[PDB]
């Protein structure tokens, strides 16, 4: 019974509780869950950015996050269950029961981590770290594995929390080729700790249209604080899906080898601040934009850079309407632990992301374009000021990573 080829009838969810949401050539449903996860990404990204200073870089994986809480939702109930459904926009899949979201998420996951004869690498790894002493719901254990491939590794939080903490940390590190290390802050995790849910995503790809290192040069990058700084500017000319949108904002899509995944950059005109664009970046707007890209010849100016970000998801989420899940008194997670202890609540939620962009990725290459004469009136895209960045799986219309490059300098 392979879930990736299974009919909803072949995967009994038998969840503790249920919620009824109100009101191309791919899967109608994974298409919808895709729309869902994106509504969360933008909304959550907006919130996140609003709480950050304009010169700070931002990076995270809305997919990871949506996946994590979707995993938690499995044992959620009542108001915790609704709030989760509402906050992560799953409730926006008309008349669909909270449990269907999971079959869908199962389908979405299959497509994303196809592992086929591809060139780009996109991997996912979810794992439950529970206290060896606790007895978790069988169904919760079962479904978490069938739908998200999450195993339930027993750890001793009661006695060796710290040793248990290193275990988790070490596992994430392995699943993220060491780019994501101490996911968990020493402070967290202790004897009281019973469960640590974790979702990892790891992607590495080569530019389908190479940037010759030989052309990379220093250029000034203009921060939002009116200052400048020296950055490494990659350069190349060629055809890319592009589009000049509202108030001169430039949208550009750089695909990776395989064509399934791309990097989309949103660059406002020097006049307009990125903060303005972020406040206007609506799910429906970002949709309109993406759908409007058209192939074109342009000059691309884009800085190399590494971005490492980490933050608590707790506050942001609460502001967005996720409260019960964090309330020792209001939380409702009966489906997770079996026999008593029912009032389990999420004490904290953390996210740590990594991003490195350059030529080659993996100092040894060059490019030679002979007999080329492009239009002297060709359109240029010079990313020497803050801009947004996305790493999406086009065919599935999924945002795997998003962020902001407000300072690529050194």
């Amino acid at each position: 019974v392979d879930i990736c080829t299974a009919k909803p009838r072949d995967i009994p969810m038998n969840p503790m509780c249920i919620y009824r949401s109100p009101e191309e050539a791919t899967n109608r449903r994974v298409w919808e869950l895709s729309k869902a996860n994106s509504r969360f990404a933008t909304t959550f990204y907006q919130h996140l950015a609003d709480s950050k200073n304009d010169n700070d870089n931002i990076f995270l994986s809305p997919l990871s996050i949506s996946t994590a809480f979707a995993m938690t939702k499995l044992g959620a109930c009542n108001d915790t269950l609704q709030q989760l459904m509402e906050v992560f926009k799953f409730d926006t899949i008309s008349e669909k029961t909270s449990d269907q979201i999971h079959f869908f998420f199962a389908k979405l996951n299959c497509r994303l981590y196809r592992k086929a004869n591809k060139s780009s690498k996109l991997v996912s790894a979810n794992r439950l770290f529970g206290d060896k002493s606790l007895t978790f719901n069988e169904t919760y254990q079962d479904i978490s594995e069938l739908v998200y491939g999450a195993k339930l590794q027993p750890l001793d939080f009661k006695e060796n929390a710290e040793q248990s903490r290193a275990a988790i940390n070490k596992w994430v590190s392995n699943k993220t080729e060491g780019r994501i290390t101490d996911v968990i802050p020493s402070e967290a995790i202790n004897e009281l700790t019973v469960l640590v849910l974790v979702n990892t995503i790891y992607f590495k790809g080569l530019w389908k249209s190479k940037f010759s290192p030989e052309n990379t040069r220093k250029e000034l990058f203009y921060k939002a604080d009116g200052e400048s700084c020296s950055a490494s500017m990659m350069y190349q000319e060629g055809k890319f899906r592009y589009r000049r949108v509202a108030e001169g904002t430039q949208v550009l899509e750089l695909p990776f080898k395989g064509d399934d995944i791309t990097m989309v950059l949103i660059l406002p005109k020097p006049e307009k601040s990125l903060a303005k664009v972020e406040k206007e970046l609506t799910p429906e707007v970002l949709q309109e934009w993406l759908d409007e890209l058209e192939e074109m010849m342009l000059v691309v100016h884009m800085p190399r850079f590494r971005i490492e970000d980490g933050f608590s998801l707790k506050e942001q989420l609460q502001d967005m309407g996720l409260v019960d899940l964090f309330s020792p008194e209001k939380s409702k997670l009966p489906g997770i632990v079996a026999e008593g202890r029912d009032d389990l609540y999420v004490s904290d939620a953390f996210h740590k992301a990594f991003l490195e962009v350059n030529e080659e990725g993996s100092a040894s290459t060059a490019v030679v374009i002979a007999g080329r004469s492009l239009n002297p009136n060709r359109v240029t895209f010079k990313a020497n000021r803050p801009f947004l960045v996305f790493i999406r799986e086009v065919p599935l219309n999924t945002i795997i990573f998003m962020g902001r490059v407000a300072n690529p300098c050194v």
Binding site: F59, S64, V172, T200, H351, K352, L355, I400
Partner: peptide, 6 residues
């Protein structure tokens, strides 16, 4: 590009 998260 190389990206990761957790």
């Amino acid at each position: 590009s190389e990206a990761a998260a957790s």
